Write an enzyme that holds these catalytic residues in place. Structure first.
Site, mmCIF file in Angstrom:
data_model
loop_
_atom_site.group_PDB
_atom_site.id
_atom_site.type_symbol
_atom_site.label_atom_id
_atom_site.label_comp_id
_atom_site.label_asym_id
_atom_site.label_seq_id
_atom_site.Cartn_x
_atom_site.Cartn_y
_atom_site.Cartn_z
ATOM 1 N N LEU A 12 -14.501 -0.540 -7.499
ATOM 2 C CA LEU A 12 -13.180 -0.726 -8.101
ATOM 3 C C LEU A 12 -12.947 0.319 -9.184
ATOM 4 C CD1 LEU A 12 -13.265 -4.651 -8.481
ATOM 5 C CD2 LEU A 12 -12.194 -3.325 -6.667
ATOM 6 N N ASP A 26 0.848 -1.213 0.000
ATOM 7 C CA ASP A 26 0.000 0.000 0.000
ATOM 8 C C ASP A 26 0.878 1.256 0.000
ATOM 9 O OD1 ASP A 26 -2.334 -1.600 0.139
ATOM 10 O OD2 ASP A 26 -2.555 -1.332 2.319
ATOM 11 N N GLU A 62 -21.177 4.554 -4.708
ATOM 12 C CA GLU A 62 -19.783 4.686 -5.170
ATOM 13 C C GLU A 62 -19.490 3.490 -6.072
ATOM 14 O OE1 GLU A 62 -17.287 4.443 -1.706
ATOM 15 O OE2 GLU A 62 -18.055 6.346 -0.839
ATOM 16 N N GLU A 99 -16.585 1.678 6.660
ATOM 17 C CA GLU A 99 -17.829 0.968 6.389
ATOM 18 C C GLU A 99 -18.397 0.395 7.654
ATOM 19 O OE1 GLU A 99 -16.031 -1.492 3.327
ATOM 20 O OE2 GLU A 99 -16.952 -0.286 1.737
ATOM 21 N N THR A 155 -22.036 0.823 -2.523
ATOM 22 C CA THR A 155 -20.951 0.710 -3.498
ATOM 23 C C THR A 155 -21.392 -0.258 -4.570
ATOM 24 O OG1 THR A 155 -18.552 0.327 -3.698
ATOM 25 C CG2 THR A 155 -19.721 -1.043 -2.104
HETATM 26 O O1 LIG Z 1 -15.312 4.183 0.161
HETATM 27 C C1 LIG Z 1 -15.274 3.025 1.007
HETATM 28 C C2 LIG Z 1 -14.759 1.768 0.321
HETATM 29 N N1 LIG Z 1 -15.717 1.286 -0.663
HETATM 30 C C3 LIG Z 1 -15.416 0.059 -1.368
HETATM 31 C C4 LIG Z 1 -14.083 0.249 -2.083
HETATM 32 O O2 LIG Z 1 -13.679 -0.958 -2.738
HETATM 33 C C5 LIG Z 1 -13.011 0.652 -1.073
HETATM 34 O O3 LIG Z 1 -11.760 0.800 -1.748
HETATM 35 C C6 LIG Z 1 -13.397 1.936 -0.340
HETATM 36 O O4 LIG Z 1 -12.427 2.203 0.686
HETATM 37 C C7 LIG Z 1 -11.366 3.118 0.370
HETATM 38 O O5 LIG Z 1 -11.676 4.489 0.112
HETATM 39 C C8 LIG Z 1 -12.198 5.205 1.243
HETATM 40 C C9 LIG Z 1 -12.524 6.623 0.804
HETATM 41 O O6 LIG Z 1 -11.338 7.192 0.274
HETATM 42 C C10 LIG Z 1 -11.232 5.126 2.437
HETATM 43 O O7 LIG Z 1 -11.871 5.707 3.586
HETATM 44 C C11 LIG Z 1 -10.918 3.669 2.759
HETATM 45 O O8 LIG Z 1 -9.948 3.550 3.812
HETATM 46 C C12 LIG Z 1 -10.396 2.943 1.524
HETATM 47 O O9 LIG Z 1 -9.126 3.455 1.116
#
Ligand SMILES: OC[C@H]1NC[C@H](O)[C@@H](O)[C@@H]1O[C@H]1O[C@H](CO)[C@@H](O)[C@H](O)[C@@H]1O
Ligand SMILES: [Cl-]
Length: 485
Positions: free
Chosen positions: A377, A95, A374, A180, A336
Site C-alpha cells: 500500500l 479506477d 514491494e 500475481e 509484498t
Molecule cells: O505489484 C503487484 C501488486 N502487489 C500488491 C499491491 O497491493 C498491488 O496494488 C500490486 O498490483 C498493482 O501494481 C502492479 C504493478 O504496477 C500492476 O501490475 C497491478 O495490475 C496492480 O495495479
C-alpha cells in the site's frame, strides 16, 4: 560495507504508456526520473501491458510506445524491471487507468466463457485467463501458454538493444491477476471487501474436468468440490470448512486443497520453463510475484491464503513448495507487504503481515533464491521505510562483509509527483541512502550472469517434499539498526 547495499527500484505510473498505446508522458517522466536519479534510485519497474501491445489482433505486437519509454529510461541512466503483464489493469468502479486483456481474446470468451476463472455462482472474472486453458488451443489456434511465450519472444526481439546494453535487468512474469501467481479469490467487483475469506475460483469447466480426473486417479470418482465454504465476505468460524477443527482437515478437504494449490504451482512451472527458454543467455533475472494474503494468518485454517491458492497451515509450508518449484529455473521471488507492521492492522482480520513476510523470505532463502519485496500500500512516512529497512536486512548491518540474509532488491509502489516533492522526497531520499548502507549509488552492483537453462523438471511429489517439516523462520530484528531519522 558494500555487501550490505540493497537496490531500490520505483514502480512507474500504471499509465506510463497511455491506454491507447501512445507514449505521452515524455516531459513529465524525464523530470520525475531526474529526481529519482538525484535520490540515488537504481532503477524503475513497469507494466508491459498485454492489452496494449497485442491489442489489435493475434501477433500484431505494437512496441512503439514502450520503445520510447525505454529510451527515456536508458537516457536517465536507470535500470529497468519489465513486468510481462498478462492481466487487466483496473476495471473497477472509480479506477483511473483501465486496460483490459486484448479484445480479440475476450471475443473468444463470448463463445467459450470457460476461458475465465469462474466462481461457484458462475460469475466470470475477465482479468486473466484460467490456468485451465494453459494447454488448450482455443485462441485462433494457440494455447494460453503459447500466447505468453510468443509475447515474451516478441519482447526479446524488439527490446534486444536494451537487454544488451544492461538496461533491462529483470523480467517479472505475470502469472495471474495483478500479475500475481494466485487465483482471483478476493475481487472487489464480485462484492468482496476486506477481510472476507474469499472464494475458491475453480468452477470453469476446464478445471472441473481436471479435478474429476484427479479424483478418479486416487480412487474417488464421486468426489466434488467442498460446499461448506461460505462466501467471499464470511469469516472462518461461520463455515464448516474453515472453522477450527473444520472439514479443511478431512481427507477430502486435504485432497481438494492440494489439487487447487498444486495447479497454481504447475501453472508457474510451465510458464517459467517457456520464459527461461526465451531469455536464455541474456543477463536478466526471472521473477514471479507472490501476493501477500496476511488476513486470517492468525487462525488455524489460514482461510484467505487457501482460497488465493497458497496451501499454508501451521504444519505445512505452502510458500516453500513454491520456492522449491522456482529453484530449477533460478527464478526469484518478489513478495509484498514489506512496509507493514501487525500493529497497523485491524484486529478482527486476524492479520500477521510481519510473520507472513518472515515466512516467505525464509522459504526463498532456504531454497537458495534471490528474494525481493514491494510495499503493498502507498506509504511516504519514516515508519514504513524503517519497516522496509528491517525486512531488507533482517539481521542488520554486517561491518565485516555481507549480512547472513538480505533482500536482493526492493521496489517502491509508486512514482507520482507526490513522491518527488516536499517532505516526501526528503524521506524517500533518506530511505534510499539507508537501503544503500549510506554508500553512493553503484550501477554495477549485483551483476547478472547469462541466464542458464532451467534444470530438470521435477514432479509435484518432489516439490511437495518442501512442505514439511515446517520450519520456524530466521529471526528478524525488531527494528532496523540504520533507521531514516
Ligand atoms: O505489484 C503487484 C501488486 N502487489 C500488491 C499491491 O497491493 C498491488 O496494488 C500490486 O498490483 C498493482 O501494481 C502492479 C504493478 O504496477 C500492476 O501490475 C497491478 O495490475 C496492480 O495495479
Ligand atoms: Cl530443510
Amino acid at each position: 560495507v558494500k555487501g550490505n547495499y540493497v537496490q531500490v527500484y520505483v514502480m512507474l505510473p500504471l499509465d506510463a504508456v497511455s491506454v491507447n498505446n501512445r507514449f505521452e508522458k515524455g516531459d513529465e517522466l524525464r523530470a520525475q526520473l531526474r529526481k529519482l536519479v538525484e535520490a540515488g534510485v537504481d532503477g524503475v519497474m513497469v507494466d508491459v501491458w498485454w492489452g496494449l501491445v497485442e491489442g489489435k489482433g493475434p501477433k500484431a505486437y505494437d512496441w512503439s510506445a514502450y520503445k520510447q519509454l525505454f529510451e527515456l529510461v536508458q537516457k536517465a541512466g536507470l535500470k529497468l524491471q519489465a513486468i510481462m503483464s498478462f492481466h487487466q489493469c483496473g476495471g473497477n468502479v472509480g479506477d483511473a487507468v483501465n486496460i483490459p486483456i486484448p479484445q480479440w481474446v475476450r471475443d473468444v470468451g463470448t463463445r467459450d466463457p470457460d476461458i475465465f476463472y469462474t466462481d461457484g455462482h458462475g460469475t466470470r472474472n475477465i482479468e486473466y485467463l484460467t490456468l485451465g486453458v494453459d494447454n488448450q488451443p482455443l485462441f485462433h489456434g494457440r494455447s494460453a501458454v503459447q500466447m505468453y511465450a510468443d509475447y515474451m519472444t516478441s519482447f526479446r526481439e524488439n527490446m534486444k538493444e536494451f537487454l544488451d546494453a544492461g538496461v533491462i535487468v529483470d523480467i517479472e512474469v505475470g502469472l495471474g491477476p495483478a500479475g500475481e501467481m494466485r487465483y482471483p479469490s478476493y475481487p472487489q467487483s464480485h462484492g468482496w471487501s476486506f477481510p472476507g475469506i474469499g472464494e475458491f475460483i475453480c468452477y470453469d469447466k476446464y478445471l472441473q474436468a481436471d479435478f474429476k480426473a484427479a479424483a478418479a486417479a486416487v480412487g474417488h470418482p464421486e468426489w466434488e468440490f467442498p460446499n461448506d465454504v461460505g462466501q467471499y465476505n464470511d469469516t472462518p468460524e461461520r463455515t464448516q470448512f474453515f472453522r477450527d477443527n473444520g472439514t479443511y482437515l478431512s481427507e477430502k478437504g486435504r485432497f481438494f486443497l492440494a489439487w487447487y494449490s498444486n495447479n497454481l504451482i504447475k501453472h508457474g512451472d510451465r510458464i517459467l520453463d517457456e520464459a527461461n527458454k526465451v531469455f536464455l543467455g541474456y543477463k536478466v533475472q526471472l521473477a514471479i510475484k507472490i501476493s501477500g494474503i496476511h488476513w486470517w494468518y492468525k487462525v488455524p485454517s489460514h482461510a484467505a491464503e487457501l482460497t488465493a491458492g497458497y496451501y499454508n497451515l501451521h504444519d505445512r509450508d505452502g510458500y516453500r513448495t513454491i520456492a522449491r518449484m522456482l529453484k530449477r529455473h533460478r527464478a526469484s521471488i518478489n513478495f509484498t507487504c514489506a512496509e507493514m507492521r501487525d500493529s497497523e492492522q485491524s484486529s478482527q482480520a486476524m492479520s500477521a503481515p510481519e510473520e507472513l513476510v518472515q515466512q516467505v523470505l525464509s522459504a526463498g532463502w532456504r531454497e537458495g533464491l534471490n528474494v525481493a519485496c514491494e510495499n503493498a500500500l502507498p506509504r511516504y512516512d519514516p515508519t514504513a521505510y524503517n519497516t522496509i529497512l528491517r525486512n531488507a536486512r533482517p539481521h542488520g548491518i554486517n561491518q565485516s562483509g555481507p549480512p547472513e540474509h538480505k533482500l536482493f532488491g526492493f521496489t517502491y509502489l509508486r512514482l507520482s509527483n507526490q513522491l518527488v516533492e516536499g517532505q516526501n522526497y526528503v524521506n524517500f531520499k533518506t530511505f534510499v541512502d539507508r537501503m544503500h548502507a549510506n554508500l553512493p549509488r553503484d550501477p554495477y552492483v549485483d551483476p547478472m550472469a547469462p541466464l542458464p537453462r532451467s534444470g530438470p523438471e521435477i514432479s509435484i511429489e518432489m516439490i511437495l517434499q518442501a512442505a514439511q517439516p515446517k520450519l520456524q523462520p530466521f529471526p528478524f530484528q525488531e527494528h532496523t539498526d540504520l533507521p531514516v531519522g
